[PDB]
Every structure is written in C-alpha cells, then in structure tokens.
Ligand binder design. Structure first.
Ligand SMILES: O=C(O)[C@H](O)C[C@@H](O)CCCO
Ligand SMILES: C[C@H](O)[C@H](O)C[C@@H](O)C(=O)O
Ligand SMILES: [Mg+2]
Ligand SMILES: [Mg+2]
Lengths: 402, 402
C-alpha cells in the first residue's frame, strides 16, 4: 500500500489586480494591457453606458487579478493552481479556508471541498469571487495529490476517452484560427440591445464575413457575455441562422434561468444556446440544465473546481447534454479528456491580435501546453498532477499569512 | 428648487473579522463573543461534522466582520451604512466601486446601483459577500441623500402606511420576548438530518415547551439556517404542526429552488415556508417567489440594498406574498414601515442570553432605536436619512484608500 503524507501548509499569493501590476495576465484572462482584442468594444451589461462602452477594463473587469494557491504536504511536496480572485482570494484562503485544509490527508479532497462549501455558504453567493477561490483550492489539492502519487490528474479520474483534445478558438480572428488548425472560431458580440437593429446587423455581418473566409465546415459561434435580453438575443440568433452559427453563448445574466428557457425555445432550428461560465455550485447547474440549453460551460476555476466539474459532467451526460468548459488550460484538459460528453474544448486567445498561440494562462504557468495544429495530444498531459509548475519569477505578493 | 451637491468621496472601514477584534458585533450579527445563544449548537450545513457541530464560529461564521461605507458630498455632509463584508468589502469599495460613486449627484442612487451590479456581475455570484458590499454602498447613498434633503428615508419612499412597527423576536427565549412585548418568537433548530428522528423530536419538543409557556396567540417559528433537506424539513414541519408553528424558515441552501417548491407543497396546511435572507438580486427573488414560498426575507444589507428591497416588496405584493426582511435595524425600518405587505418585522437578539434589548447593530450605530414593548413608533424614525450616526469610538480600520 502507498503511504500518503498530510497537508502541512496552504498559502495564497496574487499578481495583477487593482493592488498590483495592471495587465499581469495569468489567471485573470481579462487582466491584459492595451490594444487587446479581448477589450475591444465587447458588448456587456455595462456597454449601454457611454463611458463604459469601448472598454471592459474601464468598468473594472480587471480589478481582481490572479489568485495563486499552493498546498504543501508534510513531505515537502507541493501542488498549486491559479484562478481569478487576487488579494481578496488570499484573504479567504489564509483567514478562513486554511482551517479545513491543513492537517488533512492529501487524499481528503472531496471532504475539504464539502467543508469549504458548507463553511462559506453564508457569503459565497453560490458563485463568483468566493467560488473562484474555493475552486482554486480544489485544483491545488488535486495537483498536489497527483504529484504525490506520481500520476496525471486525467489518469486518476479514470483515463482519457480520446487520444487528443481538439479545440475551437475564441477571439477576433476565426480565419487566423482556421489556419492554425482549430476546428472553429467563437467571436464576441460588439453591440447590444441599446444598439437595436443596427447592432444586430453589424454583429451578424461580422459572422457573415468570417463564414465567407472560413468555409462551411469551420464552426462559428458568438459569445454575448451576459449583455442581452431575450428579444435581442432571439433576433440576433435568427439573423445569424443563414450562416449556420453553431451556437450563441451566454446571452443573459446568470440568474435569468427562465429567460434562458424561453431563449432556447425561440432559437432557430439546430442552433444551440449555451451558458454557464459564470455559474457556480452543482445545484445551480441542475437549474441551468433544466432550462434546456444545449451546452453548459463552467470554468473549472470558477464553478467550484475539478470536484464540481466532474459532477456537472455527469449531470449533463445523464441528460444527453454536452459540457464544454470555459478556458481553464490544463485544469480543464485533464478533466475533459476523460469526458465522453466533451468532444471538443476551448482555447481563449490571450494573444492581443489573435495571431499567435500565447499560453492560456501566460505567464504564470511554466511549461504550459498550447494546442499545436488545434490539438493537444494526451501524451502532452502525461505528467504528475496538472503537469505544470508555478512561475516564481512573476512578482507574487503574499498579502496575508496565518 | 432645491440645490443638490455632488458626491466627493466614498470611504470604507471595517471592524471585527479575521483581521481585527473577534466579537466586535456591529454589522456582522455573528461576530459575537463566547456563551452567546447565537452560537449555541445551531444546526447548519456544517454541524454534521463533529468539529463544527457545537459552534458556528468554529467553522468561521465570523471571519468577515463589519463593513462600514461612508459617502461624503461636496458640501461636507455625509451618509453611511454598515453590513457584513469587512476588509474584503473595503477592497471592493475602494478599488472598484468608487469609480461609479464619486462625481455623481447625491440623487443618482438608482444609476449608481445599476452600474455597481453591471460592473461586478462577472464576480458577484448574484449574492453573498459582493452583494453585501453593494448593498452597503446603496444604503450609504440613501442615508446621504436623506440627510442632504433633511428627510427620513421612509418619507422619501412615500411615507409610513402604519404608525408603528410591531416585532417578533429571534432568539432562544420566546418566553422572555413575550414579556418584552414582542408578538412572537423565532427559535433556531439545534439538530439536523444527521440526527434523524431524535433531532426532530428534540427541536419539536423545544417548540412544544415554548408553546406551553407562551400561550396560543404568541407566534412561534423555527429558523433552520440552510441546514436541512426536503425530507427532514417535511418531517420537522409536520412534527411541529400540533403546536401551530407559524412558519419554518430557510430549511435549504439558497440555490435549491426546486427543493423549496417541493417543501412548500409538502407543508402542513396553514403552515408557512419562508427563506430569502441569503438570496441576492431582484432576479433571484423572482425565481424564489415562483417556488410558492409564503414569505421572502431579504436582508437589506445583503440582498442588494434598499433599492433592491423596494423592488422585492413590489414583486411579493404583486403575488400576494409578504416580505419580512431579515434584521437590518433602521435600514429595514424605514423601508418596511412604508410596505403594506410587511405587517410585522424582525428583531434578532444580540443579547447573549436574550434577556435584554441590546441594539441590533450594537455598538457601531449611535442612537440606534430598539423596540420598546415590542414596537418602534414611526416618530422614532423621524430623523434625516436612516437617523443614526457612526460610532467613531469603535476601532475602525481603513485597509485601503484611493
Ligand atoms: O467564453 C469565453 O471564452 C469568454 O466568455 C470570452 C469573453 O471573455 C470575451 C467576451 C465575449 O463577449
Ligand atoms: C439563529 C439563526 O441561526 C440565524 O443566525 C438567525 C437569522 O437566520 C434570522 O432569521 O434572524
Ligand atoms: Mg463565454
Ligand atoms: Mg433566518
């Protein structure tokens, strides 16, 4: 029998965010610099305001920054993970959650997870900031466990059900993505309800243009980042039907379950409606799944962690729905390669102009895998835990201790 | 016409919490000391764990502490409010929300509220910590506006619809509350699902005992603080029917809307099922209301603020449902005294043994009204804003600035 060490320490750091260096990248996808496609007039719940229409950074989409959680075993072996939470995330880990982590066996992952959810239920809001923090701890624990055992997380889960992961790319250049080998391209909408018919015409024209440039089989999708209402989303969906838009994503704020049910009913035949990247907790996904949307897209570092993601996958599978996680790099790779119902995955372009394969969490992860010709072979993931190391060269800050 | 000043500064402080003095009380109801009824073997989602069964403080119900938000107008007049968020709440106000507040007219309350919701949607989780912070800002704004205009918030809202507010008391001593003049007493359950039939027997016996001591007309209620499941809650509800328990509260975690619908259907005839203190955003309450529960109980400082509470009241009223806010002291008083569908209100005993009328938010609020003979006359609320001043004698800490 294999002997397992206990967890000795848990520590949290952060980079980027309102109290560090702006544009640090890493865990917080939106903590970028200037002239980045990911901040180029993207439609949001705030773009109806003139002062917040051109830039998401202007309303503060980058204030949190990156949270880094590292768990150390008694034998000095360590595991870690990153997510979006920054300094406040550090407070939660160092001043609250540490009590459930330290002293546990490295294999007590599900126990620690349940205790974190139970202990923070009174202030977690079942999603967002607090759940991002819990997710980061969960991932760090899986990483440590796999590194202690000497196995990649995907093998601990029951092995891969496919030899490689195929990706679609999210960014402003589906055409460049096709050249890179991706199977599809998801573009962000730039106009919203306040833009009316003109907004619909413009975003639909954007899709029409890429359809002409990419061909019929390369998938095209629209990401709406919680910026619409049912009527606008319905009009946009129908305006894009002629171009065989594969799916229209997150048209509504997360609490609007009833609206998603209506939107899905109104959707053009064969066109999928998706959401989920901002939802958290298994129970929320149960409610989301029952709205009838085609694909739920939890972010492994935001939905509650790998422990929760695996449950969401089972939920979707029981209903014949697909689960295609939001970004997440290796944290998603090790999970989805084992999911029969995750036939493809997402790669969110961190490259300012979507012309290069800059790593998903650049530069916080050392040796971070990137799709080559739109794919990541399972052999690439054949390393202990999630297979990466923390880039200690980054200016990590430790705001709290215990 | 009256001239209104612009908002010049917004500042956040905190007391209590994991990074200050434990047991500070104030905004965080649970940041108490030892031997307090509010921490006496209260059933929770964590009490199934032996190490966290006896005390909620042990699992960290007190790590956040009190958040204090003060908004200052150009004319030097100030308004403020308190809630549960502490240090992290300060980060959110000083490093993110300040951009939507400063520079606005003191009357731009609803605008600032919508911008706070839109700008934090990507990490707010629609409730909990972030929403508590937003609520605190909202309340501070109403306070400032009323103080600038020279009117109590309840008059700005459209006046009182009753001359006094009648209260029920939450605590371990319904009998002592009856002597104090309260119209009812809500007790916390001490056992949970893991305790099975014995747990049900014990909490039901507790209700039976108070029914014998208090008489038939004094109301009795059970608060279950998200600690049960549908079957346990159903059994407990039926076990308490013989004693005419008025309602059984928050039996399930907030995301379990489907469970609440089932619980309400299973409830004994005439017995009410309530929840809502941990829910946030108007949309969540729409979903909650549709489960059919009888009373929604948002906390003004957690649900999104006064701006949101007024909307929730309209939602409930449109359906014939009642809205009875969770604690909140003056922040609830000024709102509910104007609600036709809030016939009574709650006073959560901060007194360690529920024998005295220690102020709801003691000691952070100066001149904080307390029910006298179970009531608060509207004349008591006849002061600008929410009618109270910040107890600057407390050891307020300013972790962030901008
Ligand atoms: O699904 C995703 O990769 C994210 O939602 C992309 C998002 O950050 C860009 C805004 C699109 O409207
Ligand atoms: C005593 C209970 O656990 C809560 O702290 C009280 C709260 O839920 C209320 O409704 O007052
Ligand atoms: Mg998306
Ligand atoms: Mg309650």
């Amino acid at each position: 029998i294999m002997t397992l060490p206990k967890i000795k320490h848990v520590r949290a750091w952060f980079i980027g965010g309102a109290t560090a260096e702006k544009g640090a990248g890493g865990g917080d996808y939106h903590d970028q610099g200037g002239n980045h496609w990911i901040d180029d007039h993207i439609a949001t719940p705030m773009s109806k305001y003139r002062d917040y229409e051109q830039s998401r950074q202007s309303f503060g989409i980058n204030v949190l920054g990156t949270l880094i959680v590292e768990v150390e075993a008694e034998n000095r072996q360590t595991g870690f993970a990153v997510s979006t939470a920054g300094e406040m995330g550090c407070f939660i880990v160092e001043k609250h959650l540490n009590r459930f982590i330290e002293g546990k066996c490295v294999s007590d992952i599900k126990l620690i997870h349940d205790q974190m959810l139970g202990a923070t239920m009174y202030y977690s809001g079942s999603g967002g900031l607090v759940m991002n923090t819990i997710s980061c701890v969960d991932l760090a624990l899986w990483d440590l466990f796999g590194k202690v055992v000497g196995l990649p997380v995907y093998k601990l889960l029951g092995g891969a059900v496919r030899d490689e992961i195929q990706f679609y790319a999210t960014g402003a250049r589906p055409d460049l993505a096709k050249e890179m080998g991706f199977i599809g391209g998801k573009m962000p909408t730039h106009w919203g309800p306040h833009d009316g018919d003109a907004g619909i015409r413009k975003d639909a024209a954007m899709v029409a243009d890429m359809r002409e440039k990419c061909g019929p089989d390369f998938w095209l999708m629209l990401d709406c980042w919680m910026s619409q209402d049912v009527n606008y989303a319905t009009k946009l969906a129908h305006a894009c039907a002629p171009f065989n838009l594969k799916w229209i994503e997150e048209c509504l704020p997360p609490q609007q379950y009833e609206g998603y049910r209506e939107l899905k009913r109104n959707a053009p035949a064969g066109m999928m409606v998706t959401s989920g990247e901002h939802h958290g907790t298994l129970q929320s996904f149960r409610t989301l799944a029952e709205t009838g949307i085609d694909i739920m897209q939890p972010d492994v570092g935001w939905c509650g962690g790998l422990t929760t993601l695996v449950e969401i996958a089972a939920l979707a599978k029981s209903r014949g729905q697909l689960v295609v996680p939001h970004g997440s790099s290796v944290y998603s790779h090790h999970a989805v390669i084992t999911f029969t119902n995750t036939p493809f995955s997402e790669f969110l372009m961190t490259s300012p102009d979507c012309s290069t394969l800059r790593p998903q969490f650049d530069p916080i992860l050392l040796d971070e895998p990137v799709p080559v010709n739109g794919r990541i072979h399972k052999s690439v993931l054949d390393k202990p835990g999630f297979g990466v190391e923390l880039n200690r060269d980054c200016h990590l800050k430790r705001p709290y201790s215990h």
